[PDB]
DNA sequence: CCTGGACGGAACCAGAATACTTTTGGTCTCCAGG
C-alpha cells in the first residue's frame, strides 16, 4: 500500500492508499487520513459566539452560514443560531407518509446498535434517556427482544446482519478454532479479516445486488461517536445518485460499564446519558437536514446484562484431574476442546460423567451439543465443540485456580457478564423502531432477533436471502411494506383407509387380553414432501399413519376441562393389538420390542385419556405405538397421565398434537435419505431422536378449547428421546419433583417443529395468516415478566 | 504527599512474547515502607 498519497477530497469516500472508516483497522490509510478526517478542534457544538463565524477548515464542525449548503454544519447549529427546536423537544406527530425531498426514491433506513443494552433499562424513562423514550413511546416497540444464543456480541451482531441462526452464519462465537482451516479466530489479531469465517449474506451485500446503496456497517474502534454520526449526516447530503439508503451505527456503550459496575449499579445511569445524548445528535441532524420524517430509525441491541461476581465461579480442576489436557472458552458458557486438535487420546465420556450431578447445587450443566435444547440451534457447525457447557445464570465457569493455595483476598474488579441461554431475563434486549414504514405509538410483543433481517429487507424494498426468520411474522410491526406471505403446498395427500385385514391375517407376536369436528381442530398438518400415509379416525384421537415409518407423523385429540384421567386396567398392562385399516407389512411388531433388551414402547394418545373402557381398547392399537426407552418413558408417562389434564384444567380444554422427531445430523431439519441410524433391534422400525407436542387452547380461556372464537394460544416442546435421565440430577426422585423443570428446559416454537418433520400446522382457521405465522414464532420461555 | 506490590485467571483492556494468538498485569484499594 502507497501511503504518500491524499485523502484530500476523499474522506469517508464510499468507493492506492484509502480514506475509508476501516483504513485504520487495516493499517491502510493515506499519511494525513487523522490530519484530514478526524478534524477535532472546538468540539462537537454550536454555541451563540460561533454563529455566523467565518467557515475555519481546522474545526470538527461548522457554524458559518455557508454549513447548511455544504451539509458540514454542527448537529446543534438550527437549534443554537436559527432559533430552532431539539427534536426531543417537539410533538409526537405520526407520520402517515414518508415526507421525504424530491430525489429521494425510498426512505432510508439507518440501525442503531447499542452493546449490552439489557431490556430493562428502559424503565428509566425520559429522565435519563429522552431522546430514546421519545422514539420508543411515539414509534413501535416490543418489551424486549430475544438474542440468539451464546449472547454474545459478535454471534448476535452478525445475526441481526444475515437473519440466521450462529450455527449457519458461522460466527458462532466472539473466538472460535476451525479445524478444517486449522486456525483461530480472535477479537485481536488479522485472522477475523479474512471472508472465509463470515456465512450467510449480510444486508449490506442483499441491498447492492438489488441497486440499494449501502454506507458502511462497520466503525474503526479509534473514531469517535461525534464523527460516526456527522459522516452519516454528511452521507445523506450527497448527489441522488451517490447517496446511499442504509446505514449502520455501533456503540460499544453501554456494555463496558455494565461488566464494571453491574446492571443494576447507580453507575449505569452516566453512560446511558450519554448514548441518548448522541441519539439526540442523530434526531437534530436529520431534523437539520429536513429528514426527520423521511428516514426510518431503528434502535436494537446485541444482548443483555446479568450480574456476576467472582464469588460465583466453578472451577472444572474440582472435577477434572487433568485440566491441562484441554482447552476451554470460559465464563457464563463453556466449549471444552483436546489442548492437541484432532488429539486420539481425548476421552469426553470421561469428562462428561465426571462432570454430571457431582456437586449438590452444582452451577452448569455438561451436554454434547446433539443433546443441548434445540430451541438454541447450536450444534450444525464444525466451530461448535462436541462438549458444552450450559452454565447457571449469575454464576461464571474457569479452567483452575492459578495457586489453588493463596487465601481470600475480596478483591473483584467486574460485576456483570452476558453469554447464558438466550431465554434468562438478563439476557433480553431493545427493540425501537421509529419512521414512516412503522406503526405510530404501538407495543408489539417480544419476538427473536432473527426476524428483523426480514423486516429490514422489506423496509428497504429487498428481497431476502434465505434464512431463519418466518417471512411475515413481524408484519404488525408495519404500517405498509408488508410481505404477502402464502401457505406451502402440499405434496402428498393422504389415504383413508377402511377396514381390509382379518385379525388372523397378522403374525406380529402381540398379545391383548365426528371425531375430525372434535380432535383435529385447525385441519390436517399438511405433509410438505412425497410420501404414503394414512388418516385413520378414533373416538378419542385422529392420526396420520406413516407408511416408511411404520408410526404417526402426528397424533391429535383434544381434551375438554372437565376431562377424566383414568387407570390402565392391570389386565391390559401389555395389550397390543393389530390395526385391521393397515396391512401387517406396514405394522410395527411386539417380537423385535421383546428381543431389544434396551428399548420399550409408548403410545402417542394416552390410554389414560380415553373417554371410556370400551374407547380405550383403540389406545393399544399397534398404529398407535412409538419406540421409548424406559427412561424416557417416565418422561413422557408424567406428561400423558398428569400434565396433560392440568393443562386442559388451567386452560379450559386443551387440543394436542404429539409425534416423532428424527434428528441423527443435528441439523434441525427432518431427516432424510438413510440419515437415521438407530433401529428397533432386528427390525426397520426407525428410533426418534426426540417426540414432540404442540398444545393450543383458547387465548380468551372463558371459551373452550373447541370453540374458539379468537386468537389461539400455544406452548410446545421437543423433549430429546434419551436411554437415561442423567440430565436431570434429581431422576431418581419421584417425576414430580423434576419432569416438569426438564419439559420447560425443551420448549418450543410450533416453526421449530416445522423444520424438523416437514409438517405445516394451523391451515384452517379463522385467523389471518400473519397472525397464525407469529403463533407460530411464540416460545413459551417460563420466565416472569420484565 | 511519594514508590512498590498484590489483586487473579473468571470481566475488559492493552502491553509484551509465546509472536497477530496467547498470555499477563492492571483495574481499586489496601498494605508495606520512606
Ligand atoms: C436456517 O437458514 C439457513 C439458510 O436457508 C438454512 O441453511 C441452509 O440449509 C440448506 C439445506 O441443508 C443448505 O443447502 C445445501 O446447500 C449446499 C451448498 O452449500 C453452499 O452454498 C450455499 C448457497 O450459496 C451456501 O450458503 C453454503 O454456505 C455454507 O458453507 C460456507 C462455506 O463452507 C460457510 O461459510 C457457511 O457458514 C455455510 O455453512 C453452513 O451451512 C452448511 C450446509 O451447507 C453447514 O454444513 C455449516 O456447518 C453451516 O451450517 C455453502 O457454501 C448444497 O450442496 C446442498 O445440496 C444438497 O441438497 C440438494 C437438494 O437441495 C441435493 O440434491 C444434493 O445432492 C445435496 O445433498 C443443499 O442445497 C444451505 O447451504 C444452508 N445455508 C446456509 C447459509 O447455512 C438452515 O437449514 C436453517 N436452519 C433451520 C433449522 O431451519
Ligand atoms: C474423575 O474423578 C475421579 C474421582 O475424583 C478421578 O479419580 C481420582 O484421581 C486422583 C488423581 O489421579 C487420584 O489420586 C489421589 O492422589 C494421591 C497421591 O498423589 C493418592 O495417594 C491418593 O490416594 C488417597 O485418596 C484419599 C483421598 O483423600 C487420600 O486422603 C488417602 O490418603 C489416599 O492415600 C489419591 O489417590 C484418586 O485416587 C482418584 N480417585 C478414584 C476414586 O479413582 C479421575 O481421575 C477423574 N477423571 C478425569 C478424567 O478427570
Ligand atoms: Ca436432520
Ligand atoms: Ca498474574
Ligand atoms: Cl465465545
Ligand atoms: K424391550
Ligand atoms: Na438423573
Ligand atoms: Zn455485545
Ligand atoms: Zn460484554
Same mark, same amino acid.
Given at each position: ?167 449457519? &452464519? ?24 479474512? &471472508? ?178 434445540? $430451541? ?6 464444525? $466451530? ?106 402440499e405434496?402428498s395427500r393422504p389415504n383413508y383407509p377402511g377396514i381390509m385385514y382379518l385379525q388372523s391375517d397378522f403374525?406380529l407376536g402381540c398379545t391383548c387380553d365426528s371425531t375430525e369436528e372434535r380432535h383435529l381442530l385447525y385441519g390436517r398438518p399438511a405433509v410438505?414432501? $412425497?410420501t404414503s400415509y394414512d388418516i385413520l379416525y378414533h373416538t378419542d384421537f385422529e392420526s396420520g399413519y406413516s407408511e416408511i415409518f411404520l408410526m404417526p407423523l402426528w397424533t391429535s385429540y383434544t381434551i375438554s376441562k372437565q376431562a377424566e384421567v383414568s387407570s390402565i386396567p392391570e389386565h391390559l398392562t401389555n395389550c397390543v393389538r393389530p390395526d385391521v385399516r393397515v396391512s401387517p407389512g406396514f405394522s410395527q411388531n411386539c417380537?423385535?420390542y ?6 420399550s414402547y409408548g403410545f402417542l394418545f394416552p390410554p389414560y385419556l380415553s373417554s371410556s373402557p370400551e374407547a380405550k381398547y383403540d389406545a393399544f392399537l399397534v398404529t398407535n405405538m412409538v419406540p421409548m426407552?424406559?427412561?424416557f418413558k417416565?418422561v413422557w408417562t408424567y406428561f400423558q397421565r398428569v400434565l396433560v389434564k392440568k393443562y386442559a384444567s388451567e386452560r379450559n380444554g386443551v387440543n394436542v398434537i404429539s409425534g416423532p422427531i ?23 422400525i426407525?428410533?426418534p431422536?426426540?417426540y414432540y407436542s404442540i398444545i393450543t387452547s383458547c387465548?380468551?380461556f372463558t371459551q373452550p378449547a373447541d370453540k374458539c372464537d379468537?386468537?389461539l394460544s400455544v406452548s410446545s416442546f421437543?423433549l ?30 410450533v416453526?421449530?417443529i416445522?423444520?424438523?418433520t416437514?409438517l405445516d400446522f394451523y391451515r384452517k382457521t379463522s ?20
Open positions: 500500500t502507497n501511503t504518500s498519497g491524499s485523502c484530500k477530497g476523499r474522506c469517508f469516500e464510499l468507493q492506492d492508499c484509502r480514506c475509508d472508516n476501516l483504513c485504520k483497522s487495516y493499517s491502510s490509510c493515506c499519511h494525513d487520513f487523522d490530519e484530514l478526517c478526524l478534524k477535532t478542534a472546538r468540539g462537537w457544538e454550536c454555541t451563540k459566539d460561533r454563529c455566523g463565524e467565518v467557515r475555519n477548515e481546522e474545526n470538527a464542525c461548522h457554524c458559518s452560514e455557508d454549513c447548511l449548503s455544504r451539509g458540514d454544519c454542527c448537529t446543534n447549529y438550527q437549534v443554537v443560531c436559527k432559533g430552532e427546536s431539539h427534536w426531543v423537544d417537539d410533538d409526537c406527530e405520526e407520520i402517515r407518509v414518508p415526507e421525504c425531498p424530491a430525489g429521494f426514491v425510498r426512505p432510508p433506513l439507518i440501525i442503531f446498535s447499542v452493546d449490552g443494552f439489557r431490556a430493562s433499562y428502559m424503565k428509566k424513562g425520559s429522565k435519563v434517556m429522552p431522546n430514546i423514550e421519545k422514539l420508543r413511546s411515539c414509534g413501535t416497540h416490543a418489551p424486549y427482544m430475544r438474542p440468539v444464543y451464546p449472547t454474545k456480541t459478535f454471534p448476535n451482531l452478525y445475526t441481526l446482519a444475515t437473519g440466521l441462526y450462529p450455527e449457519s &452464519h458461522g460466527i458462532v462465537g466472539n473466538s472460535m478454532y476451525d479445524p478444517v482451516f486449522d486456525a483461530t479466530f480472535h477479537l485481536r489479531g488479522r485472522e477475523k479479516f479474512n &471472508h472465509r469465517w463470515w456465512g450467510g449474506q449480510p444486508l449490506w451485500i442483499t441491498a447492492t445486488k438489488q441497486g440499494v446503496r449501502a454506507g458502511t456497517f462497520f466503525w474503526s474502534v479509534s473514531i469517535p461517536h461525534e464523527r460516526r454520526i456527522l459522516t452519516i449526516l454528511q452521507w445523506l447530503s450527497l448527489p441522488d445518485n451517490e447517496r446511499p439508503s442504509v446505514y449502520a451505527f455501533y456503540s460499544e456503550q453501554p456494555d463496558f460499564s455494565g461488566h464494571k459496575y453491574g446492571p443494576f449499579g447507580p453507575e449505569m445511569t452516566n453512560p446511558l446519558r450519554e448514548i441518548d445524548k448522541t441519539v439526540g445528535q442523530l434526531m437534530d441532524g436529520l431534523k437539520q437536514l429536513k429528514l426527520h420524517r423521511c428516514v426510518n430509525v431503528i434502535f436494537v441491541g446485541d444482548h443483555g446484562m446479568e450480574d456476576v461476581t467472582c464469588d460465583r465461579t466453578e472451577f472444572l480442576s474440582n472435577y477434572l484431574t487433568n485440566v491441562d489436557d484441554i482447552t476451554l472458552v470460559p465464563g457464563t458458557l463453556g466449549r471444552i476442546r483436546p489442548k492437541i486438535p484432532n488429539n486420539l487420546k481425548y476421552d469426553p465420556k470421561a469428562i462428561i460423567a465426571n462432570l454430571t450431578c457431582k456437586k449438590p447445587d452444582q452451577h452448569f450443566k455438561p451436554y454434547m451439543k446433539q443433546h443441548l435444547p434445540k $430451541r438454541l440451534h447450536y450444534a450444525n457447525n464444525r $466451530r461448535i465443540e462436541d462438549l458444552h457447557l450450559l452454565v447457571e445464570r449469575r454464576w461464571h465457569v474457569a479452567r483452575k485456580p492459578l495457586d489453588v493455595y493463596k487465601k481470600p483476598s475480596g478483591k473483584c474488579f467486574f460485576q456483570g457478564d452476558h453469554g447464558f441461554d438466550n431465554k434468562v431475563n438478563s439476557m433480553q434486549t431493545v427493540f425501537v423502531g421509529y419512521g414512516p414504514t412503522f406503526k405510530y405509538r404501538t407495543k408489539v410483543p417480544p419476538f427473536e432477533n432473527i426476524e428483523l433481517y426480514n423486516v429490514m429487507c422489506d423496509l428497504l424494498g429487498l428481497k431476502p436471502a434465505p434464512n431463519n426468520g418466518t417471512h411475515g411474522s413481524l408484519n404488525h410491526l408495519l404500517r405498509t411494506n408488508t410481505f404477502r406471505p402464502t401457505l406451502p403446498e405434496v403374525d410438505l414432501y $412425497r417380537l423385535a421383546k428381543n431389544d433388551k434396551q428399548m426407552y424406559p427412561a417416565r428424527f434428528d441423527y445430523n443435528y441439523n434441525g431439519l427432518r431427516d432424510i435419505e438413510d440419515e437415521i441410524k438407530q433401529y428397533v433391534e432386528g427390525s426397520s426407525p428410533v431422536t426426540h387465548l380468551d379468537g386468537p421437543i430429546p428421546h434419551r436411554p437415561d435421565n442423567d440430565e436431570s440430577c434429581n431422576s431418581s426422585e419421584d417425576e414430580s419433583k423434576w419432569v416438569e423443570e426438564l419439559m420447560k428446559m425443551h420448549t418450543a416454537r416453526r421449530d416445522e423444520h424438523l416437514g385467523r389471518s395468516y400473519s397472525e397464525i405465522l407469529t403463533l407460530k414464532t411464540y416460545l413459551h420461555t417460563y420466565e416472569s415478566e420484565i
